[PDB]
Design a protein around this ligand. Structure first.
Ligand SMILES: Nc1ncnc2c1ncn2[C@@H]1O[C@H](COP(=O)(O)OP(=O)(O)OP(=O)(O)O)[C@@H](O)[C@H]1O
Ligand SMILES: [Mg+2]
Lengths: 519, 296
């Protein structure tokens, strides 16, 4: 029932998931029974018992054939399109009809035939467990949720997700993009101030990378560009360390077999490399030790953050090439960006944030934990934004969400060029920012002339131009010319510009009045 | 209301209008652009309230054409990537660093003049097609050999510096000079124009003079010759370096091997520079524009 809904926010990624709710209109991330707030999206079975989260991540050694992981992408995807690279260790999907399936032993009996569960079945079980843990934490039964998704999920994938939630007895009020959840996590805070900003969302995960460029004006955001890279990521960061420590171990122990060829050894090396990576992401020095790598041989060594970034230098310029590729695809310049929010678990690395600090001018604000005191957890941004949206839409009727999420509401012709006024001294001042959305009315306060009196407010069109680098405005066609009579010396003149849906432009220039209409 | 510390223009003498306002221009559909919003946030919920008041039931189908007008979606184009795999490139032969790394990835048409985006796209396409787990299940034990070939090509061409090194060493994408008398039967200037632009890649100055036809002016002739005679190139031969056994750890052996490969690299660079100089000399010898210029 709409009046009795129990809503939460869910972030559902390839690597891990997260759950969140709202307390006193403030988003708070939920910890599960294990105490984890970033819960790995991994399922594992032992003796017919279902395990999830950290236990399932740990049980990779215990069960080769009962571990399922990296199944988020496979949802709503045909056999040809699905990629099993990250899933190579996990059960091989078998093409049954159009829906690949994993074959695992989920029954309790030791001589029982293993079940062949579908990807939808697995997503259903995982969302059921997530909802259940949210239910124990809340003390009430969770009934609803808003789930974040990337912008390139197909309609078939959305249908698969809603069907999985329905089979998990969870009704999805709305699917929102992770960049939108991350921006809302900041904008919906009490201390936040709405203002026109160019926002870059850099969601750097384990198996994926997303860079999205948005223009946020009047507290509402319009997507300018998006890029999604599957090559550079936390898995590659773990891999350069697995090879580095495999070389070190092999050199120290002559005649030892390379651990990379043994599945158990490589899994242990990845888990220990990930733990060492997070330890060196929280500290400047990290230890690396594994008892009995192979043939009973132990290994113990150390590594510093400087050596980590030195062996990982190539990915840093890969991320740079990604960010300039995205800005060029959005037709923008680094001088045009106001804020870059760095999101995802990998976003806790200080050196990447410093790299964007050197890439972008100092006027741009880099919202990352190591570069801003007021920053939020990059792994919590999406889940908190989803929880805030769930608390905002928990009372709407399903018809209200359906109508509010249609193209008739979202679509509008954004004014391409800028609208401003010409200033002269004995330059184009923008009033209406470019790429206006729906009806926009902006206000500016300008200085009067040296003595004042009669003053000319000439409103013209404007365009941005880069001069070699520094950004200037270029005055184009003239829109309107108004006059204010007898302005006081040193007084301020208030100028308002309103662009109505009808494309009607209303101009006002009253000193603190003249009004005009452009059809 | 934004406060700006900038002065407004004084009104010119003898200017007036009805209610002190003059309309000159207007906004156009060319001056605007249609994009679609993401349905998120309280200000969007207020906008949706207003739209539900104005229109109630949303005309999604009618406005689908408007949304289709100016929107960007993912472009899936594997038609060029399909290409052809004759005899499966020696039946999935696998041998490090000694094979063709543009045929596996369908790069024959583009070769050096390629884009990282298409490289990534082709890599993803043929990983999906020839993945060992995905497709070798049907008995294709040696498919992983091909997957290894895609992987090797992926690392070698992934980074700019090393991919440039490989291109520089063995691009295998060059035109031999048309010294043959049988070849020398068409227009001399067109026959030579292609070679200079083909090898012009390595120059320091990106804008490069490009020879020309008979009508080429004397100043252009001088500029072209001066630029080619004094030419700086970044062609390098490191990719051909001898590999080292992993067992070796001695600093002395590593130092000795490093010196040996460095000297070989210097020798290769010098011989390449001499070869380029020889080609430039042969071109000057063939050219008759100088003879025409002396005659004027
Ligand atoms: N506290 C941390 N410090 C540093 N790195 C971390 C931390 N927590 C997680 N990571 C790493 O960052 C990545 C997780 O990033 P992110 O939160 O964006 O992933 P996800 O949401 O689980 O997945 P997806 O990328 O599919 O959206 C992984 O590589 C993980 O190992
Ligand atoms: Mg993520």
């Amino acid at each position: 029932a709409p009046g009795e809904r129990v809503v939460i926010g869910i972030t559902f990624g390839n690597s891990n998931s997260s759950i969140a709710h709202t307390v006193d209109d403030k988003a708070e991330v939920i910890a599960n029974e294990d105490g984890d707030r970033q819960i790995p999206t991994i399922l594992s079975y032992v003796d017919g018992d279902e395990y999830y989260g950290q236990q399932a991540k740990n049980f990779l050694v215990r069960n080769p054939k009962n571990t399922v992981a990296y199944f988020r992408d496979i949802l709503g995807q045909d056999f040809k399109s699905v990629d099993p690279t990250h899933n190579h260790a996990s059960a091989h999907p078998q093409e049954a009809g159009d829906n690949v399936v994993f074959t695992i032993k989920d029954k309790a009996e030791e001589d029982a035939e293993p079940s062949t569960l579908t990807v939808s079945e697995i997503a259903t079980r995982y969302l059921r467990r997530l909802v259940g843990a949210a239910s124990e934490y809340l003390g009430k039964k969770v009934t609803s949720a808003v789930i974040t998704i990337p912008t390139n999920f197909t309609e078939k994938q959305k249908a698969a997700l809603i069907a999985a939630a329905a089979a998990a007895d969870l009704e999805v009020l709305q699917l929102i993009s992770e960049p939108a959840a991350a921006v809302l996590a900041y904008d919906a805070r009490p201390e936040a101030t709405i203002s026109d900003k160019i926002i870059v969302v850099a969601d750097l995960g384990g198996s994926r990378s997303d860079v999205t460029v948005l223009a946020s004006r009047s507290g509402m955001y319009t997507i300018l560009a998006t890029v999604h890279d599957y090559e550079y990521h936390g898995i590659a960061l773990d891999k350069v360390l697995i090879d580095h420590f495999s070389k070190e171990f092999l050199k120290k122990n002559p005649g030892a077999k390379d651990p990379r060829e043994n599945p158990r050894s490589l899994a242990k090396l990845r888990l220990e490399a990930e733990s060492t990576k997070r330890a060196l992401s929280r500290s400047t020095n990290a230890s690396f030790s594994v008892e009995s790598l192979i043939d009973g041989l132990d290994f113990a060594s150390t590594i510093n953050r400087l050596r980590y970034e030195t062996i990982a230098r190539t990915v840093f310029e890969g991320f740079n090439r990604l960010v300039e590729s995205a800005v060029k695809k959005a037709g923008l310049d680094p001088l045009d960006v106001d804020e870059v929010i760095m999101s995802g678990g990998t976003s806790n690395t200080p050196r990447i944030a410093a790299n964007f600090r050197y890439i972008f001018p100092e006027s741009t604000r880099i919202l990352a934990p190591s570069t801003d005191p007021s920053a939020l957890n990059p792994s919590e941004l999406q889940a908190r934004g989803a929880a805030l949206q769930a608390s905002l839409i928990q009372e709407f009727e399903t018809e209200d969400i359906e109508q509010s999420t249609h193209a008739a509401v979202t679509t509008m012709p954004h004014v391409t060029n800028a609208i401003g006024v010409v200033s002269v001294s004995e330059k184009f001042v923008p009033i209406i920012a470019p790429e206006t959305a729906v009806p926009a009315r902006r206000t500016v306060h300008l200085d009067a002339p040296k003595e004042g009196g009669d003053v000319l407010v000439k409103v013209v069109e404007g365009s941005t131009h880069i001069n070699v680098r520094e950004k200037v405005w270029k005055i184009g066609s003239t829109l309107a010319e108004a006059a204010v009579r007898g302005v006081k010396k040193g007084a301020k003149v208030e100028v308002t510009i309103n662009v109505n849906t009808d494309l009607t432009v209303i101009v006002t220039a009253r000193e603190v009045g003249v009004r005009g209409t452009l059809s | 209301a934004t406060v700006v510390s900038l002065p407004l223009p004084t009104l010119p003498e003898g200017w007036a209008a009805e209610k002190d306002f003059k309309a000159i221009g207007k906004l156009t559909q060319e001056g605007s652009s249609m994009r679609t919003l993401e349905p998120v946030g309280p200000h969007f919920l207020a906008h949706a309230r207003r739209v539900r008041h104005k229109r109630t039931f949303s005309e999604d189908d009618r406005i689908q054409a408007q949304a289709k007008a100016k929107k960007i979606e993912q472009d899936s184009d594997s038609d060029i990537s399909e290409e052809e795999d004759p005899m499966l490139l020696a039946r999935d032969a696998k041998d490090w660093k000694t094979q063709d790394h543009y045929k596996v990835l369908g790069l024959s048409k583009y070769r050096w003049r390629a884009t990282e985006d298409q490289i990534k796209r082709a890599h993803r396409k043929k990983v999906l097609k020839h993945h060992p787990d995905k497709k070798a299940a049907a008995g294709r034990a040696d498919d992983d050999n091909f997957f290894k070939c895609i992987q090797k090509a992926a690392e070698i061409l992934l980074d700019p510096v090393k991919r440039r090194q490989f291109d520089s060493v063995d691009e295998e994408a060059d035109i031999p000079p048309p010294t043959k008398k049988q070849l020398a039967k068409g227009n001399y200037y067109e026959l030579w124009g292609k070679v200079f632009e083909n090898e012009a890649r390595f120059s320091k100055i990106q804008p490069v003079p490009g020879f020309g036809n008979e009508n080429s002016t004397r100043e252009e002739v001088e500029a072209f010759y001066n630029f080619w005679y004094n030419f700086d190139s970044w062609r390098s031969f490191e990719y051909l370096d001898e590999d080292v056994p992993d067992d070796n750890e001695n600093r002395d052996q590593k130092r000795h091997m490093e010196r040996k490969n460095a000297n070989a690299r210097k020798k290769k660079k010098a011989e390449d520079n001499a070869r380029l100089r020889k080609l430039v000399e042969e071109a000057q010898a063939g050219d008759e524009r100088i003879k025409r210029f002396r005659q004027e």
